[PDB]
Amino acid sequence: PMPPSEFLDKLMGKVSGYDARIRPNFKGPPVNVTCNIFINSFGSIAETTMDYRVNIFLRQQWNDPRLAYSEYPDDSLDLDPSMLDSIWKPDLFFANEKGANFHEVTTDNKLLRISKNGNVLYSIRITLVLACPMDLKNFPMDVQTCIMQLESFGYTMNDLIFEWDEKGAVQVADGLTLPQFILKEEKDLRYCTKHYNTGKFTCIEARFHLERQMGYYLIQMYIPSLLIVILSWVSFWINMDAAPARVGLGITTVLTMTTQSSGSRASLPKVSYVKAIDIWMAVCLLFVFSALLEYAAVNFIARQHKVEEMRKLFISRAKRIDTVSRVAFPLVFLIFNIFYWITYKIIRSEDIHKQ
Amino acid sequence: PMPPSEFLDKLMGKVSGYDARIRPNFKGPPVNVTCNIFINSFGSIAETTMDYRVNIFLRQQWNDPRLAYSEYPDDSLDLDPSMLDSIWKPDLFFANEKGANFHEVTTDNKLLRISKNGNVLYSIRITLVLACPMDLKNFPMDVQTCIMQLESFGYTMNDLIFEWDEKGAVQVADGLTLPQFILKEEKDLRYCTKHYNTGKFTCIEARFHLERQMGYYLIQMYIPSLLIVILSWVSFWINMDAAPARVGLGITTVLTMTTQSSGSRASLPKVSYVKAIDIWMAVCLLFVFSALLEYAAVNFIARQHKEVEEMRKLFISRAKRIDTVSRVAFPLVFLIFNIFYWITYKIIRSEDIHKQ
Amino acid sequence: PMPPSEFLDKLMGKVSGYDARIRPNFKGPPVNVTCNIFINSFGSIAETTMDYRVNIFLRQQWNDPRLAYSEYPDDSLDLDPSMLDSIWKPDLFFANEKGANFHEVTTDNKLLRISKNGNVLYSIRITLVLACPMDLKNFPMDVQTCIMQLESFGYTMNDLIFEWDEKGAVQVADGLTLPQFILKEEKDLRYCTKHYNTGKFTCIEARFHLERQMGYYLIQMYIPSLLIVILSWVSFWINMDAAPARVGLGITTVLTMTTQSSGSRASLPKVSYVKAIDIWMAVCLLFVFSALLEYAAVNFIARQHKELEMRKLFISRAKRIDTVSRVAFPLVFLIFNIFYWITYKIIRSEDIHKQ
Amino acid sequence: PPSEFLDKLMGKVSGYDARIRPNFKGPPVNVTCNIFINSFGSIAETTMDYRVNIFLRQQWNDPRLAYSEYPDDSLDLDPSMLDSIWKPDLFFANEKGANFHEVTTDNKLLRISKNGNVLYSIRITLVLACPMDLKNFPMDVQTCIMQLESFGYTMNDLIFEWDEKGAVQVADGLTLPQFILKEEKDLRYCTKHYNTGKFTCIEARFHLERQMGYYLIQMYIPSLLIVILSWVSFWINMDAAPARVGLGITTVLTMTTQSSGSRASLPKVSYVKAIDIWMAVCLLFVFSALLEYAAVNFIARQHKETVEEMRKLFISRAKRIDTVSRVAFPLVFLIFNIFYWITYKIIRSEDIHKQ
Amino acid sequence: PSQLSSEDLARVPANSTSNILNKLLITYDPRIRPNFKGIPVEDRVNIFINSFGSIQETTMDYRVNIFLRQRWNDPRLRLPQDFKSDSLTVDPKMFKCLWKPDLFFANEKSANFHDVTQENILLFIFRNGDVLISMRLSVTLSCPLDLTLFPMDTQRCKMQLESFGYTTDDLQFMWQSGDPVQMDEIALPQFDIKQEDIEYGNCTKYYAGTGYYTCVEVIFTLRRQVGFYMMGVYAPTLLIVVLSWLSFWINPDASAARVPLGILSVLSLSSECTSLASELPKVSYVKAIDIWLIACLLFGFASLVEYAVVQVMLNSPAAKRIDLYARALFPFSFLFFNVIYWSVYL
């Protein structure tokens, strides 16, 4: 009955005497803010810069006593986004954020709702670039923990306290599929209170567990690496007295393999610890490099002969090495392959336990 | 006993007569401002553009006699961040800044606290793309000093003087482990007053020492170079008359070193002095190149006999002795080079460590 | 004893009657503006886009009769930077400017000082990416002139005239060192008045002479090119009948030299003239191609004996070709090296005379 | 006095409504447009766009803004006053990202004549979209398009006209690095029809010609060297299978990299370009070089299979193929070259007629 | 301007927006929606495609420039028969003082308005009260891509228009009855865009604790042009296979000749595969182009393994049968693969 416009002015207005500068319940118990997050999109995870981008809906709930209304029967009246300036809002901000911006497509992407008891609901559409320190050992098979830190710049824990919502704290949009990662459904909600010389400030943290899909890594690096090792083994069936042919084969494989190893570092950041792709690349280089010395020994042993019995002995030894190599080289690679994967599988299992 | 709104108007309000345009203690002693630095995030050091990025909290403290209150018994008051626009705030700009922005993720990221005596505590979240000159004389095993300069643009030292807080000037976060650098605990705090035609202006400087981590360069640069040098020595066991194989081996090793050296310079700026990595690559390139010359000599000596039998045997024996000595000398001389190269750079670094 | 707040309204106030819209000395002689720049940082020179970035302090001085004060006995009164909004300021802008911005790191980086006579000092901190056309006839060892043009958009020569300051028009920061260029200590200050359809406008220009450093280019392109040439020469000592070795040696050097030339153009614009580096890369390619070309003549001459004592003469001719080549190719290269450097040095002196 | 007049012309007393167009409920207002091109560059094939820095001038008679009391005509106003006057809503329909400069002040001009004519000049930087026809890619002419349309006012309110004299003006000494800007510019009327109605639009076309210096030195000459290198094989010994086959394969592989490199810059188009014809024929010639030795090796070995007289015939057959090829391959390349360069010059002549 | 009925309004002009618009907006509150506490508003939406392009595969997005049209009946904004014209074409600056729906693109990555010389907005007010607001927007939408069948694939890219603050009880979005998406005569470099667009609609979103929200979606069908990859990928790989067959004519005893021919052919194809991966995102599934590259590598690999068998047979103490058969079958087997491959992918 009473006009809608008057209610906007009569409440939280100059006549009302509401002061947006003064927090609710001044000189009293700390304000308690419950927070929700809805993840619209997750992606753009970059190892080089150690950051990821996310688009979220940040919802906050708090109780302002000065905003209670009994004149209108309806509850949870939606307000206008343009009048949010005069509403008192908590100074939440992201500790690990590197770049954030609001969204203004047609109007401001903001929602404000006020219930009769004074409860306030305020949701914003934000895009976050968040810093994520990464441990890049076990690089191909690595679970990565991403964190989001929400803490208060200006209000101490005597005035503003942040808590996670009981039901549906972090909610993920339906059918959200990361390109090269898998996001686990278990989310860790922790308290990490911050202490500064200025004082103590409230902080809440949400942790995401990301598993790396290994389809791409097998096709583009592991399988090509297998070819270079196998192609090197072709030399063991080439004639013994084919020094241009066999050495040329050896050099091309070894040098191509080094370029393939150099290809991997392009995207990775410059780190000073050994990774799992290094242990693969190092052993692969050892196998091709040992093939070159295999022919070098055969060539040297053959010429060592310079009565007739001596050349029979030396020539047999060079031939024997090639026949032994034809089985020894594939066999040792098989032993290494079995040990490599099982060792790295049990580690990955423990990674799930560590989450 | 006083409503909060009324106190906000009675002090620093229009009725109060506080003009933020005039500095405290006008026509009097210079305003003294204390400064603090909390390093929230350090990283993105880029050699090519010779800059680094940093996320910090900047706290300034200055005594304003006008902003004094006796109505409220509390020692301090956490005022609203939005009302800073009517506060007199000292001008502070960074002399070596190439880019900066404020943070407006949800609200204004600033803190204002006013004490009873009139002290003001004013804290800001800033992201700075600062520029640091880098020596690069010894690209591996170097220590770099970054600079942060805090100075005033409009107020001279007769009016505004900037100092460093006595306790805890620079405060690093709990972790903040840089991927490529190690940040030393000791930080130098110095005064570097600036003089211009406009006048004399105050300035304070904080220097950070960063030591480059050697793990990445050993695995991805030195070890690949070592492999090619060893690969070259394989030519001293192949047949003496196998011209396509040995020449093919020699050329492929030398050319690979050139591409490896070319790869290294890409990430570096176009400086015009010789770096430590250059000396390594040059000597390694010298070794592999000398291997090719070794085959050239033995090839010429071997066929020299045709150009009776006694001369032929002597030349072939002369040719073979080159191979025997080469397969021993070339590893050994490289070994001797490695001892000299590493030992000198360590003593050089250790003396520089004292300087840094 | 005048209050500071009250005095600041007696000038630049509603009571004052000062209109910032109307220029000083309306309907009268032109306003004389003296300008200074302080070079705080120089760098980011980019050949590909033909621009450079500079951070400067721009100071301006003009006499405003209205801003005359007598109550305060101070020779000058430094004023708050915020006051700049209420004072007439000339509309200076840069004609070669691609992008420029102000700095608001903590406060506006501006300085205003007013003297008793009415002089005004107005210093601004600006960072500008300036366009510089470049002449790359000699890609190294050239002198590039970078200009800065300061002109007025809306005020004609009848109202606003710009002048350089008699002393210290351009001042450079202490210890400024460009990484790949050397900045000369002599800067030419000239006048270039502009005429458009809308009238005549004042403009002042300051040009900087930058000299490229040769230290980088010598150890990264000239020495590598010299290595490829000297590598080709060893073929003259390789056995005459070893066709796979020498032919493989000849082709590999020529192809690698081609790649080295391609590497040089990565950082250069797609210019249609001939650069100095092109002459070096062409001559180096000419030498290595000739070495391969020589072997084809030796092979053709050598096989003639079997197809056709005639045997001895054909074999003798082939050996003499190799023997002369071992001294001809080094010597002819040496003559080229002497000619190439000395001719361009006198060209460098001529360009130094032209600044 | 100056200050009082500005209020009188457009102020609270004046009642000048900036929201009503001139000659309301009457004939459309006439708009005369000028363009001065201060900078032309950043022509990128990949994104099919170019960047321009221009001064945009508009003239429209406003009857309300007529002054008789000041004797002087065309008195220049302050740039800040532009908020008060009614200004047409020009925009560039084919544009991508626009920005004002505000380097030290707003780069704007305002002039008002006694009769009421208004002149409003602004400095703009524009990234405009240019569709490109990449057929005849090294020898092509590209027409750039600049469209000025009115977004809010239909043909009853706002009509656009080009200035009779000096519509598009180019700054003195403007030299595009990669293109030659012709001095003839086409101005047409292209009215746009939408579901809202008819809106005025004017278009100015720039005719650009690509400089051929860069592509000759960097693409055609390197390609013509690999072809010649292939011909060296025709002099190497027939029995030298490792040499000629090695030489053959290296040239073919090197040509393949060059062809891919040539297309790296320009976009992924689905039509055949001029550069593709050249690279294809070059690939055909080097491939035919590899395919001629294979026929000579096979024809020779057939002697082993009058056994001696069988041997002679086969050996002669092999030599004849090599001798004929030595003159045949250069001759066919020459005939292709003259055909290739004549037809494209003819097509280029037709293209300039279209321009 | 015009806020709180333009303050005193002492000025007295004659029958202009100084009078009509101010009288129209004397009691107008933009904060209160039309038909407050009643029927939800029905907002007709149209799109005009100025420029479609920049379909980036690395970031799986595309950038479009469009004009957004909206229509809604405003009971308060009724022309009081003062003007016999059915339109007002008021100044574009007035958009700030009137109610506007809070439309936002849910799948959008970055958006910007455009300020060439003025705000690029059109406002129309019909006599009945209907409002037509037009706006120039440049939006970077996000498109998930399925890169199986990669060289010859079809991709559906959507555009979702939904409200942020008003639920389905207050604000409802629907597509215009006739010609909702008026495209322009445009051409794409690497893709082909059809004129048949699926106006799916619905898309109504439910968010826990806030309620239902209206949405409308337009799906664009894009077909890739296969011409570029013919010259770019298929033809180079087909060439390298042909060189591999050349070894079968080279002398059986030419170890230093055939072996480089085999190894350099295999390694050349492998490098070509790596270059293709650079443009494509790091997907974990196989693509159509891969089955081509695997077979080409298999044929290249089988050439070198063929010579190794010949070298064993010659030194085993004939081997000409192995070479002679290889010359016929190796081209022949490749022909069958091509027939099956292209037929399967049409």
Ligand SMILES: CC[C@H](C)[C@H]1O[C@]2(CC[C@@H]1C)C[C@@H]1C[C@@H](C/C=C(\C)[C@@H](O[C@H]3C[C@H](OC)[C@@H](O[C@H]4C[C@H](OC)[C@@H](O)[C@H](C)O4)[C@H](C)O3)[C@@H](C)/C=C/C=C3\CO[C@@H]4[C@H](O)C(C)=C[C@@H](C(=O)O1)[C@]34O)O2
């Ligand atoms: C020993 C070198 C000769 C030339 C041998 O090289 C090869 C072939 C045969 C030659 C005889 C190939 C070579 C590896 C070696 C075998 C080496 C290993 C299997 C490991 O290495 C050891 C040595 C290393 O000490 C430098 C030692 O210190 C550590 C200490 C710390 O850990 C406790 C660690 O924090 C610190 C950073 O480092 C550590 C025990 O790891 C394995 C990790 C090797 C990795 C090397 C490479 C992977 O990709 C690189 C590059 O992109 C490429 C092109 C070539 C690779 C290569 O060249 O790999 C490469 O450089 O064999």
Ligand SMILES: CC[C@H](C)[C@H]1O[C@]2(CC[C@@H]1C)C[C@@H]1C[C@@H](C/C=C(\C)[C@@H](O[C@H]3C[C@H](OC)[C@@H](O[C@H]4C[C@H](OC)[C@@H](O)[C@H](C)O4)[C@H](C)O3)[C@@H](C)/C=C/C=C3\CO[C@@H]4[C@H](O)C(C)=C[C@@H](C(=O)O1)[C@]34O)O2
């Ligand atoms: C001639 C080609 C045969 C294959 C010869 O090539 C080689 C070796 C032996 C073969 C017989 C190598 C070749 C150069 C030639 C020798 C050529 C020169 C020493 C110069 O060139 C002449 C020819 C040129 O005409 C196109 C001629 O016109 C001018 C006219 C105008 O000025 C008046 C000018 O505005 C216009 C644009 O051009 C002009 C007199 O300059 C010298 C400048 C050569 C430059 C070429 C190259 C440098 O880097 C390029 C590329 O990055 C690379 C990978 C290979 C180089 C190469 O391939 O260099 C390269 O392409 O010898």
Ligand SMILES: CC[C@H](C)[C@H]1O[C@]2(CC[C@@H]1C)C[C@@H]1C[C@@H](C/C=C(\C)[C@@H](O[C@H]3C[C@H](OC)[C@@H](O[C@H]4C[C@H](OC)[C@@H](O)[C@H](C)O4)[C@H](C)O3)[C@@H](C)/C=C/C=C3\CO[C@@H]4[C@H](O)C(C)=C[C@@H](C(=O)O1)[C@]34O)O2
């Ligand atoms: C057929 C290949 C065999 C193996 C022959 O290949 C070679 C050497 C000898 C082998 C017997 C080399 C090969 C070309 C052929 C000769 C071919 C031509 C002179 C033309 O080509 C044909 C093929 C083309 O589509 C492959 C075909 O369809 C058109 C249809 C439509 O137009 C009507 C068009 O909309 C659509 C896009 O394309 C059309 C009939 O024109 C000429 C235009 C060739 C261009 C090919 C290339 C140029 O740069 C490419 C690449 O960067 C590189 C590394 C290799 C080149 C190559 O590999 O070139 C390359 O791929 O000879």
Ligand SMILES: CC[C@H](C)[C@H]1O[C@]2(CC[C@@H]1C)C[C@@H]1C[C@@H](C/C=C(\C)[C@@H](O[C@H]3C[C@H](OC)[C@@H](O[C@H]4C[C@H](OC)[C@@H](O)[C@H](C)O4)[C@H](C)O3)[C@@H](C)/C=C/C=C3\CO[C@@H]4[C@H](O)C(C)=C[C@@H](C(=O)O1)[C@]34O)O2
């Ligand atoms: C077997 C490889 C040898 C070296 C053969 O390589 C070649 C030729 C002949 C050699 C004998 C060439 C090679 C492909 C293979 C044929 C391989 C396939 C048709 C597929 O592969 C299989 C094997 C794979 O297990 C290694 C197997 O996954 C396991 C583990 C899984 O657990 C997570 C489990 O889910 C599953 C059940 O089982 C799985 C069935 O996929 C196919 C997916 C491979 C494509 C590879 C390539 C295409 O572009 C790549 C690269 O850019 C390039 C440079 C070279 C290519 C290449 O190298 O192509 C390349 O790497 O033949």
Ligand SMILES: *[C@@H]1O[C@H](CO)[C@@H](O)[C@H](O)[C@H]1NC(C)=O
């Ligand atoms: C508006 O009013 C004026 C006089 O006040 C009148 O002349 C004019 O015709 C009116 N316009 C209409 C009725 O459309």
